[PDB]
Structure 1
């Protein structure tokens, strides 16, 4: 008889109806879950602020009471009677007395840099002086990007919308240029704040050892200097040290190397307008390299605050995000009030007054020389916007802190330390007895509080210190999530109406179903739930983008995968959804590669070395990533993370991930650490198609055509190389995988070899194909022959020698300082171990004796033992032979690229044989 009032469904009992609303109709039951606030319990933060206000009030006046405390506390939300009845409590009066007591207290270097600066200045002066054609233009653009700064073209394609900004210099310059030019009027930090913050030598000559000890990824865009990676790599380390010391002592860099080319980058996948682009600054390469060493020095010498884990976020978002999920889950399980403010400091990197930064650096203990250098550098900052090959008039910066400089994120860390210390001390969440207040990600700040008044006080504190620093707290992207349980009913509930005011302009309140992201992670008022299946759109964007099949596979390999498994890891996903995602990815790859549907699953997800296509399968690589990232939580130096590890939700997720990884991996022999690569290798070298693909593991270069060298193979050539590699050729037996009720004519060779029509039969022993076989053979031997004549060998192919036994035909011979070069070329099957075939071909030459003496007489080598027979063997699937690999690596000296290209030749010859057979199929 019980029926829902929102879905008119019938349920046997009211309990089932209640859970029905809770799962089916969240918003209205959330409204029905709002608690009455008649006699709200007094939480510790209210006690603290009440006692501190009385302490001050008193000290300043001598005698005060609730009638004055209402005036001093407008938004406290407690009546004049509640203040009195609470005031009489003994711990409170003692705590007031506690705060009352506390409150009552080389010429060559010069020449080379002159040449480089002259070249840069010449370049600067020169720079200062239909649907079908639309697609062909996108092809030119995307290819010219993809062979360079690949993460550019990749992001541009997964968000493929002709993503070259678009909004134009116009609409951009009108938005940002006034902001970038307007000098902040920040008064600076008040002495009280500096005293609160108060609760180490940097300037020193550079060292070459630390110059090489500095990591620096050379895969970096130049600036407007026109100094690219290569010419700065040409600069030696001692010269680098000399110039760095010169600039270090002088304190100034040549003007040319301090310019910028500001470029605009979206934050959300769909750019709504000019207010969604981060104006990143790109300076010279030499400046960036010099600055990264100082950045490391400052990071090591002066570690940040304990609660500051945002500028080490290369592997630091793992802790902040994990702790956030843990605290949200804890507040849900034990029904404890929790207010979380997600404040945004985007655009705050360009609103830090130099007048406010210089003295903050001065009074933090930094040396005067360093402060002066930073002040000078930021005083003469001049950028030139560039969008889609169009460049603004020069713009003079007036708010400093360039989002693309090595020091910018650590020089902002001191402002972060100030603002972090500004907040009240005893405000936050007691997660497992440990107090957590702010997980300050470099960009997204987050404030945690127990009660409304404490959260509002923290908001006011951050606003005040931001205003003193000149920082503007944008009220658009910032939000507040409130979790106020209903006592006496054990119902969790979230507020809806806006309550907290960030210096006025009330903030947005998130709710049960509204989706929000704290640094790209799906979130909600209940916690991390799931991702919104944007993979389909990304795959579609890749498919329509003008890419070759190898470039699509590489983008899917390296860029989309990590991008989305980051959120997958921080998310909560069932393995069924991971399986569906894996299937979708597999089908998309099949469409891009024209592979049939009978290809084994392991082929896609096997490692490159093992012969597969990589393509990290989420179903197995996600539990591995979760286990790897959450194993060290219990050993985290930061105590809050250790406390969060105790939360049952994290433990449950870790247990589930361990189970899945155990099911989908094999224990390595050496490290005794589970690995999925072994799992996919074992599965791949088990199926009928993959059985021949066995010796690839022992030979590293055999598969170097899949990922390393897949830049010279054409799209058609690549998609047939992949077809042949996994034996995708549609022979009768291959097509018989499902249908064998037809007569054995349909199972037997088309040309009439009266045997089972196997693919190997087609390539290697069908009569017609013989021709193509020889065409491959010659090709191969000719190719490796050239190697001899770039290794200084007197080569000669096919020795026409008639031994007493008969007419044995060697492939090539050569000579250089002795050492026989009796080399045989073989392209073999894969059903027999390549090493035994190599031995069988080797012994029939070396142990012949008569042939040995014959070739010795032909070459004229003085000693019969001075010769050395050998054969290079590779299966038609393109797998090298280990013994031959070492043989031509060691004896007949050769560089590895030459042996790297042989598989390409072998695969090309094999598929050429197939196409020849198919066109003489008659």
Structure 2
């Protein structure tokens, strides 16, 4: 039943989110939320035949070997290198069964000797060799088995054993400097700047330019086993290493796990499997070969520097100044791919041509299709809007911009079965830092960034049901200052440009340094600096611009968020927005956010600009005949009095729990009849001759919290008779040992600095206890609001 699959999908996504956040977020963003809908039938019959298809690649030719031509490996594995390899352990279990524990428990020497024996024999056990493959729909509405994706997961020991081999390959034989894809530094670091400099130069000096982008799709599904084995054999690497790779690939199998249904193993006829740590290094050797097969004298002369190819993660951006120049380059790429089995998406590859014309001083754009990939024509795109050289969030071949693909991601996140805080976190730390690279490879304006920010804010407002008139700084202000900390692409793009392009001239690359001394790059740097200065405030400590201070300055100066200005001094106050979100339910988070920025609809806040009516729209609905502000509702209203005592006692119970856990003799509601009047302390506790009178207060924040704390600190500790009475009751002789103490929390859930410091210092409570008091304050306040709004008489 559909409800059953929805149940299973929700459980699976929640478990994945609890275990590993990054993989779950990356799966949710792409669209892996609907699961499989075609079952085993008409699914194995489509994907099984496409797997055991050995490519008839002839292999590299003497010409390719000579173009390539233009020892410490297999060393015994020691125990230091095992921990020298950086491994991400928050991954999925293999089909064998060992998830992380049976592999973590074994000592290092045993694993080292096991790998040594494995390479001595050269045979990975079939049980450990076995791997599974789950299916992922591409478009949000699957229509056929060809619209899915076979993500394959291998065993943990095999991934660990290959990671050290990949590290050895990277250290022993580093790639060419042109290869800036799978590199130690950031891949698309200088490649974005080089293309921009080339485009600026070709427009400036009216130089003939043609830049083509062609991607390596099915590059996982097109490398022939024999071709790669021969390539590694002729590279000079040990022949037995190649034999081991050939034995690994020739003896391979795959299990189809669709709807938890077992399936027989299936042969694979094409090499390079997805997710293996050796795959992006082995494919780097193919990149080295294809780059070495490029024609020698061809490219674009950018300031005495010749630029021809800038390899991206899985792309190949070729450049040429002459129309005939790139045709032979493309033919060479085609023959290299065909001789190795690689296939190219003519649909997803594009060519940008730029032909100048004299006697007019303008520059002309070609429109018709001229170049081709072995006969198949290449589409010609006018504007450079295919800045999708960012890896994930795959391309659309110039059909759409970067938007209309961000909105798809937002819809995929919105429809996924996640709590309102989980979507917020996924957008915070997995979507914004993912497409932000794409908005720098070309000319950009402020309006595009502002519209992207507005769309993101609209999506977040829909997720958390906030009204329209909420301070826009609330979304982008940092957590410690009070806010959702949604990073804003309006100010983080100039920040990225300034931070990266500023250090362009310090890059080891010779091409990047040439690109640094350009005209367009410097103009963009000036624009980015201007925007950053306009959207930041200089830091007092370090004299360096920061956007967080600017967002805080706007937020604390607003009307809704003025009461939050005291939250930046005690980071515990806003510990529930981001860190402690797994302990708070779904609707609870939305209610807490609503009362946190005072988005609750009152007769004052909910009628902004629409107060042309009578006093009934402004007078308190309880008959208090005063202004109906949310502070009045939540703090001073006779209908809300019972809820106020309820919340107060809810807090005093939890703090009493804490001090009891800290081994203090507590006394609830002491009864002291002073001669002056009636004094009602909250709770007293004494230990080893010293006592304290701890009273609990939840008060508004429109005044300073510390002063309000002092107003009862002095009253309870300087009465002159009450301290003697509590000293006599507790059993301590000297009245100066006992002194008053308060726990003052603003009803939005903001600690008081003096109160928090006193409570931490006078009596020992660990951080988790103080973390939960804002939760109690917010819950009590919103329950008070619901109690008030439940009836209207």
* TM-score, with structure 2 as normaliser: 0.88
Q: What secondary structure, in the 3-state scheme, does the structure 1 residue paired with 2:316 have?
A: strand
Cα distance change on mapping 1:474 and 1:832 into 2, 3 Å = closer
The C-alpha deviation readout for 1:610-668, integer Å capped at 9, x for no partner, is 11122223322332233233223232222222222334333332222222221111112
Measured at CA, do residues 731 and 525 of structure 1 come closer, stay the same or move farther in structure 2, by a change above 3 Å?
closer
Q: Give the deviation of 1:877 after TM superposition.
A: 0.8
Confirm or deny that 1:697 pairs with 2:568.
yes
Per mean C-alpha deviation after superposition, the further-off stretch among 909-918 and 855-864 is: 855-864
Q: Tell me if structure 2 keeps the 8 A contact 1:260–1:284.
A: yes
SS at match of 2:661: coil
1:110-151 Cα distance to aligned partner (Å, 9 max, x none): xxxxxxxxxxxxxxxxxxxx9989977876676566555556
What is the CA-CA distance between 1:258 and the residue it aligns to? Answer: 2.5
The match for 1:377 among 230, 248, 251 is 248
Residue 109 of structure 2 is matched in structure 1 by 238
Work out whether residues 183 and 353 of structure 1, in 8 Å CA contact, stay in contact via their aligned partners in 2: yes
Q: Confirm or deny: 8 A CA contact 2:461 2:467 kept in the other structure.
A: yes
More moved, 584-593 vs 694-703: 584-593
Q: Does 1:307 align with 2:307?
A: no
Which runs of structure 2 are paired with 1:386-425 in the superposition (5 Å)? 386-425=257-296
Higher mean alpha-carbon deviation, 902-911 vs 654-663, is at: 654-663
Verify the 8 A CA contact 1:264 1:279 in the aligned structure 2. Answer: yes
CA change 1:574–1:850 in 2 (3 A) is same
Counterpart contact for 2:670–2:680, Cα < 8 Å: yes
Q: Point out the more displaced range, 851-860 or 824-833.
A: 851-860
Task: Give, in angstroms, the shift of residue 880 of structure 1.
Answer: 1.4
Q: Structure 2 residue aligned with 1:592, among 444, 447, 463? A: 463
State yes or no: 1:158 paired with 2:23: no
- Structure 1 residues 172 and 907: alpha-carbon distance in aligned structure 2, compared to 1, 3 A threshold: same
Instruction: Assess, with a 3 A threshold, how the Cα gap between structure 1 residues 883 and 301 changes in structure 2: closer, same or farther.
Output: farther
Task: Give the superposed CA RMSD.
Answer: 3.9
Classify 1:413/1:513 alpha carbon distance in 2 versus 1 (closer, same or farther; 3 Å): closer
TM-aligned CA distance change 1:870 to 1:230, over 3 Å: farther
1:800-848 superposed Cα distances (whole Å, 9 cap, x missing partner): 3556776544433445566645433221221232233334444444555
Contact 1:516 1:523 in 2 (8 A): no
Bigger drift between 584-593 and 133-142 goes to 133-142
Q: 1:571 to 1:791 in 2, by over 3 A?
A: farther
Gap change, CA 1:609 and 1:571, over 3 Å in 2? farther
* Contact map agreement 2:309 2:316 (CA 8 A) in 1: yes
Is residue 619 from structure 1 mapped to residue 508 from structure 2 by the alignment?
A: no
After superposition, the Cα gap between the structure-2 partners of 1:752 and 1:269, relative to the gap in structure 1 and judged at 3 Å, is closer
Confirm whether residue 457 of structure 1 aligns to residue 328 of structure 2: yes
Q: 1:892 to 1:229 in 2, by over 3 A?
A: farther
> Secondary structure at 1:483's aligned position in 2?
strand
d(CA) in 2 for partners of 1:847, 1:805: 13
Moved more, 779-788 or 537-546: 537-546
CA drift of 1:909 comes to 0.9
Contact 1:821 1:892 in 2 (8 A): no
Taking the aligned partners of 1:610 and 1:900, their CA distance within structure 2 comes to: 16
- Count the aligned residue pairs: 793
Deviates more, 1:736-745 or 1:656-665: 736-745
On the 8 A contact 1:483/1:494 being kept in 2, the answer is yes
> Relative to structure 1, is the Cα distance of residues 885 and 275 closer, same or farther in structure 2, using a 3 angstrom cutoff?
same
When residues 137 and 255 of structure 1 are mapped into structure 2, their CA distance, relative to the original with a 3 A threshold, is closer
The one of 234, 243, 260 equivalent to 1:363 is 234
| CA drift at 1:735 | 4.3
| CA offset digits 1:137-188 (Å, max 9, x no partner) | 8766765665555566656665659643556655654454344323344444
Deviates most, 658-667 or 203-212:
203-212
Judging changes above 3 Å, is the alpha-carbon distance between structure 1 residues 597 and 349 closer, same or farther for their aligned structure 2 residues? closer
**Contact map agreement 2:136 2:148 (CA 8 A) in 1:** yes
The answer on whether the counterparts of 2:386 and 2:397 sit within 8 Å (CA) in structure 1 is no
Say if 1:521 and 1:789 are closer, same or farther in 2 by CA, change over 3 A: closer
Corresponding residue of 2:704: 833
> Does the C-alpha gap of structure 1 residues 136 and 425 become closer, same or farther in structure 2, counting only changes over 3 Å?
same
Change (3 A) 1:524 1:705: closer
Q: Shift in Å at residue 724 of structure 1?
A: 1.2
Q: 1:906 Cα deviation (Å)? A: 0.4
Give the gaps of 5 or more residues in structure 2. none
Comparing 534-543 with 897-906, greater Cα deviation is found at 534-543
CA distance in 2, matches of 1:668, 1:519: 32
Output the CA distance in 1 between the equivalents of 2:571 and 2:746: 15
1:503 to 1:526, Cα distance in 2 relative to 1, 3 A: closer
More helix per residue: 1
Contact 2:689-2:731 within 8 A present in 1 as well? no
Judge conservation of contact 2:163–2:277 (CA < 8 Å) in 1.
yes
Q: Helix, strand or coil: the match of 1:424?
A: coil
Task: Mark the CA change 1:172 to 1:669 in structure 2 (over 3 Å): closer, same or farther.
Answer: farther
Query: Which stretch of structure 1 is more off in the superposition, 801-810 or 649-658?
Result: 801-810
Secondary structure of the 2:51 match is helix
Is the Cα–Cα contact under 8 Å of residues 328 and 527 in structure 1 kept in the other structure?
no
Q: Is the contact between residue 388 and residue 402 of structure 2 (CA under 8 Å) also seen in structure 1?
A: no
Q: Report SS of the residue matched to 2:220.
A: helix
After superposition, give the CA deviation of every residue in 1:743-775 in whole Å (9 maximum; x if it has no partner): 556544343445443322222232332221111
Residues of 1 paired with 2:599 and 2:313: CA distance?
50
Rounded to whole Å, the distance in 1 between the matches of 2:185 and 2:96 is: 28
> Residue 738 of structure 1 corresponds to which residue in structure 2?
609
Give the superposition deviation at 1:603: 1.7
* CA 471–919 in structure 1, closer or farther in 2 if over 3 Å, else same: closer
- The equivalences for 1:128-207 within 5 A come to 154=25, 163-164=34-35, 166=37, 169=40, 173-199=44-70, 201-204=72-75, 206=77
Seen in structure 2, the aligned counterparts of structure 1 residues 899 and 246 have a Cα distance that, compared at 3 Å, is farther
Distance 2:136 2:732 in 1: 68
> Does the 8 Å contact 2:9/2:35 carry over to 1?
no
Query: What is the Cα deviation at residue 563 of structure 1?
Result: 4.0
Secondary structure of 1:702's partner? helix
Greater Cα shift, 739-748 or 581-590: 739-748
Shift of 1:682: 0.6
